[PDB]
Amino acid sequence: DISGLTPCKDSKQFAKREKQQIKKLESSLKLYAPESAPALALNAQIEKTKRRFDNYGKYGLLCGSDGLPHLIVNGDQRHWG
Amino acid sequence: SHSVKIYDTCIGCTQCVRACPTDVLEMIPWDGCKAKQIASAPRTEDCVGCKRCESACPTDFLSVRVYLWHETTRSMGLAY
Amino acid sequence: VVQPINGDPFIGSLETPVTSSPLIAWYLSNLPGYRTAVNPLLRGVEVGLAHGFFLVGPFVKAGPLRNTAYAGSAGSLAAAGLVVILSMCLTIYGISSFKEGEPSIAPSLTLTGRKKQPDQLQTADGWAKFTGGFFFGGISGVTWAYFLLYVLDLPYFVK
Amino acid sequence: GFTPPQLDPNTPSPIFAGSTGGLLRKAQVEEFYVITWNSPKEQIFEMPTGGAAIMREGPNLLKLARKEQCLALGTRLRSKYKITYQFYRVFPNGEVQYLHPKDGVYPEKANPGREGVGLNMRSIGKNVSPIEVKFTGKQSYDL
Amino acid sequence: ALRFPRFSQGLAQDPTTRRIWFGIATAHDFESHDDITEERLYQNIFASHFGQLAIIFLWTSGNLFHVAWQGNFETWVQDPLHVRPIAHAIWDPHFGQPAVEAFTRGGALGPVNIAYSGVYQWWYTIGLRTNEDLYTGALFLLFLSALSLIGGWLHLQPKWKPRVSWFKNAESRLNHHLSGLFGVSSLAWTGHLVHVAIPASRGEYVRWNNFLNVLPHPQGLGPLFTGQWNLYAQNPDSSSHLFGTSQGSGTAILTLLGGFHPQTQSLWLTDMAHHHLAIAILFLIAGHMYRTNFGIGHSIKDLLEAHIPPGGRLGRGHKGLYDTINNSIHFQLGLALASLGVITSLVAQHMYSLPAYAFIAQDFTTQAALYTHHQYIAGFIMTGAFAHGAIFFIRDYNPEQNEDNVLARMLDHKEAIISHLSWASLFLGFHTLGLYVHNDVMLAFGTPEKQILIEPIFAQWIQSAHGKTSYGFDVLLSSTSGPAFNAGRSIWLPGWLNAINENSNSLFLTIGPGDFLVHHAIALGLHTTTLILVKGALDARGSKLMPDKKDFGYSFPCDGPGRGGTCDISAWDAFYLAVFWMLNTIGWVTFYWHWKHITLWQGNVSQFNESSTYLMGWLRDYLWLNSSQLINGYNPFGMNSLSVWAWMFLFGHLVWATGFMFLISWRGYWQELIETLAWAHERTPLANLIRWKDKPVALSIVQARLVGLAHFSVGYIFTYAAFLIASTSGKFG
Amino acid sequence: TFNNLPSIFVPLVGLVFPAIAMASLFLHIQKNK
Amino acid sequence: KYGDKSVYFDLEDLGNTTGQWDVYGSDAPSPYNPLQSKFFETFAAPFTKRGLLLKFLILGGGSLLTYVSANSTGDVLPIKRGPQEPPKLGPRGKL
Amino acid sequence: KPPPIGPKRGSKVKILRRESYWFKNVGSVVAVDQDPKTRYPVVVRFAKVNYANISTNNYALDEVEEVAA
Numbered sequence A: 001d002i003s004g005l006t007p008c009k010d011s012k013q014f015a016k017r018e019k020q021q022i023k024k025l026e027s028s029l030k031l032y033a034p035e036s037a038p039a040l041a042l043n044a045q046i047e048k049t050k051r052r053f054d055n056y057g058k059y060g061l062l063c064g065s066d067g068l069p070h071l072i073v074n075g076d077q078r079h080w081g
Numbered sequence B: 001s002h003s004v005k006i007y008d009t010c011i012g013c014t015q016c017v018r019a020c021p022t023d024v025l026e027m028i029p030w031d032g033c034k035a036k037q038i039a040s041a042p043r044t045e046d047c048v049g050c051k052r053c054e055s056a057c058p059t060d061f062l063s064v065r066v067y068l069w070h071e072t073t074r075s076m077g078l079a080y
Numbered sequence C: 001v002v003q004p005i006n007g008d009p010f011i012g013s014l015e016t017p018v019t020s021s022p023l024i025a026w027y028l029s030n031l032p033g034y035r036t037a038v039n040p041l042l043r044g045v046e047v048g049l050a051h052g053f054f055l056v057g058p059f060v061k062a063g064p065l066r067n068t069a070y071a072g073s074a075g076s077l078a079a080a081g082l083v084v085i086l087s088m089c090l091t092i093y094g095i096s097s098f099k100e101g102e103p104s105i106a107p108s109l110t111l112t113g114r115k116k117q118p119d120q121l122q123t124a125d126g127w128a129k130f131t132g133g134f135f136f137g138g139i140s141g142v143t144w145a146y147f148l149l150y151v152l153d154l155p156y157f158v159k
Numbered sequence D: 001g002f003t004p005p006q007l008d009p010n011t012p013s014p015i016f017a018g019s020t021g022g023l024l025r026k027a028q029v030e031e032f033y034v035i036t037w038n039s040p041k042e043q044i045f046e047m048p049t050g051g052a053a054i055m056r057e058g059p060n061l062l063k064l065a066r067k068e069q070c071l072a073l074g075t076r077l078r079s080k081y082k083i084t085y086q087f088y089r090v091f092p093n094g095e096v097q098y099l100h101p102k103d104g105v106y107p108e109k110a111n112p113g114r115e116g117v118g119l120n121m122r123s124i125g126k127n128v129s130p131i132e133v134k135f136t137g138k139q140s141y142d143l
Numbered sequence E: 001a002l003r004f005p006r007f008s009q010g011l012a013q014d015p016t017t018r019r020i021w022f023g024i025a026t027a028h029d030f031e032s033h034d035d036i037t038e039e040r041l042y043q044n045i046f047a048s049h050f051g052q053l054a055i056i057f058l059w060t061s062g063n064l065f066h067v068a069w070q071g072n073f074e075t076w077v078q079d080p081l082h083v084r085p086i087a088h089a090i091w092d093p094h095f096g097q098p099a100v101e102a103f104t105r106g107g108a109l110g111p112v113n114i115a116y117s118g119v120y121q122w123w124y125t126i127g128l129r130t131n132e133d134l135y136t137g138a139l140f141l142l143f144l145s146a147l148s149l150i151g152g153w154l155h156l157q158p159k160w161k162p163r164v165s166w167f168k169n170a171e172s173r174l175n176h177h178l179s180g181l182f183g184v185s186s187l188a189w190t191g192h193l194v195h196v197a198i199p200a201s202r203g204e205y206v207r208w209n210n211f212l213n214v215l216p217h218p219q220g221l222g223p224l225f226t227g228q229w230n231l232y233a234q235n236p237d238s239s240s241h242l243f244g245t246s247q248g249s250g251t252a253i254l255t256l257l258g259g260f261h262p263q264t265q266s267l268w269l270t271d272m273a274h275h276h277l278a279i280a281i282l283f284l285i286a287g288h289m290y291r292t293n294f295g296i297g298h299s300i301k302d303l304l305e306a307h308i309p310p311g312g313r314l315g316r317g318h319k320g321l322y323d324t325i326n327n328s329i330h331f332q333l334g335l336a337l338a339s340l341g342v343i344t345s346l347v348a349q350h351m352y353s354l355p356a357y358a359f360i361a362q363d364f365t366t367q368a369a370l371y372t373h374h375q376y377i378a379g380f381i382m383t384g385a386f387a388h389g390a391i392f393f394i395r396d397y398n399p400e401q402n403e404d405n406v407l408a409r410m411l412d413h414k415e416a417i418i419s420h421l422s423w424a425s426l427f428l429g430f431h432t433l434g435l436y437v438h439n440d441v442m443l444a445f446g447t448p449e450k451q452i453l454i455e456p457i458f459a460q461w462i463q464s465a466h467g468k469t470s471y472g473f474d475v476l477l478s479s480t481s482g483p484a485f486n487a488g489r490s491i492w493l494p495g496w497l498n499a500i501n502e503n504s505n506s507l508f509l510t511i512g513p514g515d516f517l518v519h520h521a522i523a524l525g526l527h528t529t530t531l532i533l534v535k536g537a538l539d540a541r542g543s544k545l546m547p548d549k550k551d552f553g554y555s556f557p558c559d560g561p562g563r564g565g566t567c568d569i570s571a572w573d574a575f576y577l578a579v580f581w582m583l584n585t586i587g588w589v590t591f592y593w594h595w596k597h598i599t600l601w602q603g604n605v606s607q608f609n610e611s612s613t614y615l616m617g618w619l620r621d622y623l624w625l626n627s628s629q630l631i632n633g634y635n636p637f638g639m640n641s642l643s644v645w646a647w648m649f650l651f652g653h654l655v656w657a658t659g660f661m662f663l664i665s666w667r668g669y670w671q672e673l674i675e676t677l678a679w680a681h682e683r684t685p686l687a688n689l690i691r692w693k694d695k696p697v698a699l700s701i702v703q704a705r706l707v708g709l710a711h712f713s714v715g716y717i718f719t720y721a722a723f724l725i726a727s728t729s730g731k732f733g
Numbered sequence F: 001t002f003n004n005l006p007s008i009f010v011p012l013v014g015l016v017f018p019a020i021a022m023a024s025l026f027l028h029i030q031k032n033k
Numbered sequence G: 001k002y003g004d005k006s007v008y009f010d011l012e013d014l015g016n017t018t019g020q021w022d023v024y025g026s027d028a029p030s031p032y033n034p035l036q037s038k039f040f041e042t043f044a045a046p047f048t049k050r051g052l053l054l055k056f057l058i059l060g061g062g063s064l065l066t067y068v069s070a071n072s073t074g075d076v077l078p079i080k081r082g083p084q085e086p087p088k089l090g091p092r093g094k095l
Numbered sequence H: 001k002p003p004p005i006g007p008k009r010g011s012k013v014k015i016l017r018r019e020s021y022w023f024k025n026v027g028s029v030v031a032v033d034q035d036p037k038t039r040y041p042v043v044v045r046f047a048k049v050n051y052a053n054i055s056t057n058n059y060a061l062d063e064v065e066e067v068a069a
């Protein structure tokens, strides 16, 4: 919660970034059949995005007002990763 | 015009003057080296400053040395 | 007939049809730039008259007020101004190139090898007379071009 | 007082159809560096003013533009054609200064009879700094 | 010397046209002029400084005169927030009637130019509420210019001709300059602010006819002589003050309440008065330091010979440094330009944040023009400081008179300095460009959550160390229990806190990862410009490639193609490439400034905080977006007031491209081209009559370098001025 | 007349002062003593 | 001798050698009429002193320029016509 | 003296000449001109060339100093 940054596991705009990217990749997914290679690759990228956002949530990253993970370099023990 | 100077580190290899396209230099006898000759620069008025002399001086830094100075019509290499 | 200048191959020029021919050399030799024998004042008068018309040309029809009623008058006025400036730069040229009384720096020789008289135009007083002729001729040519645009507007193009 | 100048006479010039790299007004008010050479045969050489010239069997004469032109020509002559050459300097007043060997020998053979000038009897690092010659005409290298 | 350069017979004996250029360019290099001395050098410098002061006062008088004659200042005083300043009128006879109609602003009967210099705000804050005031000021500054001119004339005459022993009096000069020229000068400025500017803010106009009668404080000088100075801080314009009228005003003249005036969003005039007073005390005390004709004081020579550390770390210390500075005018000039550039950047960094002029924070083009101005000026002044240090190391540095001293031990580890500055610049450029590119890609891959966003924890810590509660560090001023907050709890911190916490003003902006990255770009620029300049200065005397570089001077083209090649080897060329990197650095600084501020003023700080972390945001959301109203200054259908800024924009583009000609192309192609041209002119009939007097030649390499940099920098400056002024004026947020 | 003074001074300055200055400076360039 | 077979270095006639030739400078006499020549001589001899010509040119040209620009109205140059249009209020009120 | 005056042929030597490329760098003496009138007899051969692609240069006796190795 340092530097005025909310964590990403309890951020609103971070989840909004997630939803927006998922809707963007789904808009490009209603043009192919759900079993062909393009739709399978799009679904794989979708799961990649969702796990990416959830991993950035669970690591305790700090997401600012713009909703993107702001890395802390000061030397805080929580942010040595 | 330009001020060409030959320092006492010269080995007398005659490349400074065999490279000089304007007859500025000339080898003279000397007693400071095994070759018993050193370069001199009488005709510095004909010196354009191309530094072909010191691009052919095989010494630690240089023995011949061209100093850019008052540029006249012949040091500027003008046919007009 | 591209043999060199005066048959001299180590001079930087050639007697090609454009330079040294019976027609073009004659034309370049009987016009007021090269009339080395006549005094420079008449030469400058001729030169200034010609260039005054040549300058009034592209000031009336081409200019900021070409479409207005002030096209001819103000264009001729700008041409006279450019003429005054040209006499100005000619004047500083005559002052800067040769001082007061030296002999002419022009060649005293011709292609045929005759030791001709030097062109007194290149002297100080000669160039001054040439500049005076240029100014007089140029203002006169400007006002005469204005007069011809005034009284004889119909044969010339308006567009 | 061992080698006199040669005082080039009215020799013929090479056969050349004329170029634009020739003598401009510099010759008409300043020097123009005549060169003289002596050919064994009527052969063809590159002119320093651009273009090809046909040198004449025997003595030749060329008035090109400047010192570097005649010396480049003479070096090409001596290296490619193995020919003795000598060139001059012709001021507009009339004097003809002899310049290339100035001793009858080219300026590579250290032949005695030439005084050494432009000669600083030291290594090149032992020149004084400019502050030591501040406000003096001698810049750094004339002591 | 026979021809135009009377100061160098080597250029007068030059039949070419290089002599004109080199007589222009070396006109002011007195210590290279022929047949001169140190006396004449210092005296010409003194007369030149008089001429510079004359030009400065004349230019200020022109500003005042044109604002009084052609301006709308009397209208700006009434409604400053909603009346546009006017620099000067315009009579351009090339103008078309649409342009006469568009450039008619500020309630003028003719075309005008809007004063983006802020002179209106600064004149209005110091009194000067009529055109007659500005007329009197302009006439007095004209008198001062004539005064400087006659002074510099007579100080050249043999009767009034100071000797070099007088110029070298570096202790009397220091004492006098400190005490008078700073302390008494700021004291007189306080005596203006207390007698004129504050009364002009508090209402009544105090002018020369009635400034002896008007008490600046109702108890005149009793509080000062009796020590009761607190009586000058009783009614400090308690937060309802309208600048220029007695409503909500007070009686104080000297305060430390800090913060900003609420109406003007500027600093209090009483704070400025007390400030200039306090620093006047400090400078008047410090100017009684150095030894003079009265027996007491310090000798800087022994101050330097005494500051030699035992241990030999610095070696011979500062021994022999007084003599190598006082004799060396280039060392004085280098130190002076160092300090001047740093304080110029300080002027910028503190006028954007702590504006000391009424209604300059709320107007938005002057606050950007001034910052950009003073920062480019500071960058140039800094490049010049280093260049003159290089010129010192060549011309005026005597290695024997300062052997093994701080300066000599300095030149020893020049390779260490150059290598570690190279490391810093290489590290910064590598990393920060990599991060900007990573973010460019992560946006280009639609994954902005993967960006390298480093929150600037240290600058945010300093901000929270000054009272900014936008981060929650609560340390030394945001913590109420901190003793630093408790000390100034009753002096300045209420105003300073309601200023720094107010997110409308521009001091201590809320910074984010883009600010971190562009600050590191700035560090790259500073370290790299420093690298180039320091390397040129330390290799000015020589290196391994050219050890006798001191003998060739500071400015020489090269040393030939031998030894691999020696293009741009001189310290002048280090200065050159450093001017390039300086323009780049200040461009980064001012781009950062202008975008952060235009986003703050528009309201969408999120635009910067989201888009500044990837370079396509700067190319799209700053350059492409804010250039919308500029390039449309004149369309195929009509024009507007920003036509001049678009024309200047393209003009600067043009010269910035023309510089690439002199930089990329070098001398030889142009000499050959001029040889062909000379052939043609000497064999073209009717122009054979005309023969030049100076034999035409292509520009010398060092010259053409300088010319390319002149075009390059003129284009940099004019382009960014056009863009900044037009973007901040097309909207004013 | 104050509105007519730019019309006198701008054509004066920006055209004549170049005439005077550039002419006199070209003469100062092309000089010999 | 300059006219010998391929000889171009007559050291006496250095003009023919260096190329000093009036390439088109005809020395033919005045082709103008004498009367108009005398007319132009008498009517342009005032412009014989180059210094007085320069002073006259600069001063009279500057005078005529100032006269034209001061007596000309807005009909011939829009800058003197003035706005003849109401002023637009700038952004953010006028600031 | 007719015996050698300078370092031995092969003695790795240091350069005290401030203007040379190999300043404060070691060398390898390949020859010493025993004529007692030349100014720079010490012909050194270094390992790395200078900017002119030259690995050898003449040095004086006082502009040279042998190392303890």
Ligand code: CLA
Pocket: E045, E046, E049, E050, E053, E166, E167, E168, E169, E172, E173, E176, E177, E179, E180, E181, E182, E185
């Ligand atoms: C107290 C006596 C005194 C005073 C007042 C001065 C005053 C001055 N001397 Mg000095 N001088 C003195 C004694 C004095 N001298 C003595 C005894 C000697 C004996 C050796 C000299 C020798 C000497 C030399 C050799 C030279 C001078 C020069 C100068 C001038 C410096 C240039 C300038 O105006 O910038 C003045 C700058 C400031 C007042 C302030 C600069 C920095 C501040 C901190 C910046 C921040 C505030 C900023 C100003 C705010 C601006 C806001 C807005 C209003 C724009 C100045 C007039 C130079 C000159 O011009 O020659 C005439 C010069 O070359 N002096």
Ligand code: CLA
Pocket: E419, E420, E422, E423, E426
């Ligand atoms: C063995 C490799 C090696 C080592 C140990 C060093 C060590 C050093 N270099 Mg150098 N450097 C090297 C290679 C090396 N460099 C190469 C190949 C280049 C050309 C790109 C440079 C270019 C360079 C510059 C321009 C600068 C340094 C600097 C430095 C210093 C700071 C370290 C730094 O910032 O990294 C610098 C690293 C780079 C710029 C990236 C290049 C490094 C490459 C990737 C390593 C090459 C390894 C090699 C090919 C593998 C062979 C393995 C072998 C078993 C076969 C340090 C003394 C700086 C300095 O002097 O400041 C004190 C400085 O300014 N170096």
Ligand code: CLA
Pocket: E421, E422, E423, E425, E426, E427, E428, E429, E430, E433, E524, E528, E531, E532, E577, E578, E580, E581
């Ligand atoms: C965008 C243009 C640009 C860039 C990138 C640079 C970059 C640099 N300049 Mg500057 N410079 C420029 C323009 C530029 N300059 C201009 C216009 C001039 C005027 C002539 C100068 C004048 C100048 C001087 C005078 C000096 C520099 C210095 C430097 C170096 C500073 C150290 C640093 O930050 O490097 C970090 C590295 C980089 C910025 C390189 C970026 C490229 C990446 C990292 C390479 C890897 C990409 C890829 C994997 C490689 C493969 C590519 C391809 C073959 C497949 C660096 C190489 C200084 C120096 O050398 O200090 C060490 C120095 O003294 N430059």
Ligand code: CLA
Pocket: E088, E089, E090, E091, E092, E093, E094, E099, E113, E643, E644, E647, F010, F013, F014, F015, F017, F018, F021, F022
């Ligand atoms: C053809 C293009 C052109 C030209 C020639 C002009 C001409 C002019 N404009 Mg501009 N203008 C133009 C297009 C043009 N305009 C366009 C397209 C716009 C956009 C719509 C404008 C917008 C505009 C504004 C907004 C203003 C002008 C002004 C001016 C006048 C400036 C006064 C002066 O004499 O300057 C003198 C020249 C300078 C100050 C330049 C200084 C730099 C020089 C090059 C260096 C000098 C070298 C050296 C130190 C001195 C030696 C002597 C030297 C003579 C050689 C002048 C009449 C101003 C005006 O009317 O005020 C009177 C003004 O405020 N113009």
Ligand SMILES: CC1=C(/C=C/C(C)=C/C=C/C(C)=C/C=C/C=C(C)/C=C/C=C(C)/C=C/C2=C(C)CCCC2(C)C)C(C)(C)CCC1
Pocket: E330, E331, E332, E333, E334, E335, E337, E338, E339, E342, E382, E385, E386, E387, E388, E389, E390, E392, E393, E534, E537
């Ligand atoms: C080349 C050369 C030269 C020049 C140089 C230069 C130009 C330099 C510059 C430099 C610079 C430009 C520098 C800067 C610096 C800075 C600093 C060093 C800073 C510091 C700071 C501090 C210390 C702070 C403190 C504080 C704070 C933090 C805030 C608050 C307050 C206080 C005070 C507490 C010379 C001539 C010299 C000589 C020769 C060589």
Ligand code: SF4
Pocket: B006, B009, B010, B011, B012, B013, B014, B015, B016, B017, B038, B039, B053, B056, B057, B058, B059, B063, B064
């Ligand atoms: S090139 Fe150098 S070492 Fe060789 S002869 Fe000439 S001066 Fe002597």
